[model samples]
Target: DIRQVYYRDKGISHAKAGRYSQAVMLLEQVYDADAFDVDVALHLGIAYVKTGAVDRGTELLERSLADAPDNVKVATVLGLTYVQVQKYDLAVPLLIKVAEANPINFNVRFRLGVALDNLGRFDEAIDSFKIALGLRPNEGKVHRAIAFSYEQMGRHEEALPHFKKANELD
Candidate 1:
């Protein structure tokens, strides 16, 4: 188990240094030895995804999340990955869960809005963007997202002020 711990520590160091491929190699070995270790699973899953093994990474993360449903880190990573992959349906619920868990998290709120907007849930998307805006009032991207959502719902008048704000901020 000492060797396994050594590999895990090295793998985490590589991951922190942005050497994802090396991290994946070491972490995969650790994972093989202890698939049930949630911490190992989390690091291995993230390393796998960073190395472009999206399906495998997500599967590992899903299993880890199932084992530890309260893990906000796992939820955040998986949800953001789903959004990046354009899986709006899959991203929505996970992002919503993470957002609820972290009410003051600007990124989670913004990403939730992005997922909802992609799914054509403009009203809900606007609500999320509004929350994000409250978190970072000067963020041009959130303003733009809110404007776009309002436009999608044909509320052009409401969208106009946001567009102006976004333009000004940008």
Candidate 2:
């Protein structure tokens, strides 16, 4: 287990340093020794993605996603792929999780709101936009999301000002 940890760190640092070959090699070895390290597998999958091995990356990433369904990294990368591959619905829970976990992260909040809206969770999306606003009130996109959520909730008065605020901000 210690060896696996060492190898995992090596691969992570390699990946961060743009040495995907080293990362993929070492991380693959770690997985080969024991496939139960969900975190390592997720990192290795990202290495595959970074190295332009899309099919392999998707395979590993999907496997990682299955292994740890609530893991944020697994969800985030997979969610992005879903968007690119037109499998948007599959990413809702993950995006929602990502947003809710880091309520202060703008990117996470933005995508969370979008995913909620896409999934017809208007009330949840409204809350997500509010959280994002707390972190980034000046963002026009967040205001737009607030407006859309208000509209979806049949609160025209609330939606109108948000829409107008977005326009004014722009």
Candidate 3:
């Protein structure tokens, strides 16, 4: 049990450093040892996501969020996973929470914009993208997202500047 805890700690450290494969290798050994540990679930889940096991990571993240509903990191990861699966309806609410929790986080705003755009909420999508643009003034993808949202809303004139900016940025 002590060995498992040591391995899990090391795995978490590896995941934090973005060495996801190494994290997964170590975490798998102690995986079942602490199935209910929120930290373990979060660390292992993110490692799984980085290793292309998104569905498995999503399941673990779901459980982690269920166990600790106030955990913003779990919600953020689950929201991003939902986006990967194209479950925009589910992703939006979770991402909304993340946006609320971390209003200054560019990625959260960008992802919320994406989820909203996918759901055909073009106006709201544009709003979220605008915030992301403020955070990253020269981000081509954010410009493209705003342009696409405007185009979807039939605002071609408004979309043109963003399109041009996206092209320039690219």
Report lDDT (CA) for all predictions: 0.89, 0.79, 0.90
TM-score of 2: 0.68
Weakest lDDT window of 10 consecutive positions for candidate 1 = 27-36
Residue 51 lDDT, candidate 1, scale 0-100: 84
lDDT of 1 by residue, 1-170 (tens): 79988998998888878888998989888785344988888888888899889999999989888989899999998899899889989889989989888898888889999999999999999999989988899999999999999998899999999999999989
Against the true structure, what is each candidate's TM-score? 0.92, 0.68, 0.93
Candidates sorted on TM-score, descending? 3, 1, 2
User: What is the C-alpha lDDT profile of model 2 across 36-129, one tens digit per residue?
Assistant: 7777777777788878887788788898888888788788887766654556587676776776676666876677677777778898888888
Query: Cα lDDT of model 1 overall?
Result: 0.89
Top TM-score hit: 3
TM-score of 1: 0.92
Clashes of each: 0, 0, 0
lDDT of 3 by residue, 1-170 (tens): 69987998899999999999999899878777345788888999999999999888888898898899999999988898888889999999999989988988898889899999988999899989988988889999999989989998899999999999999979
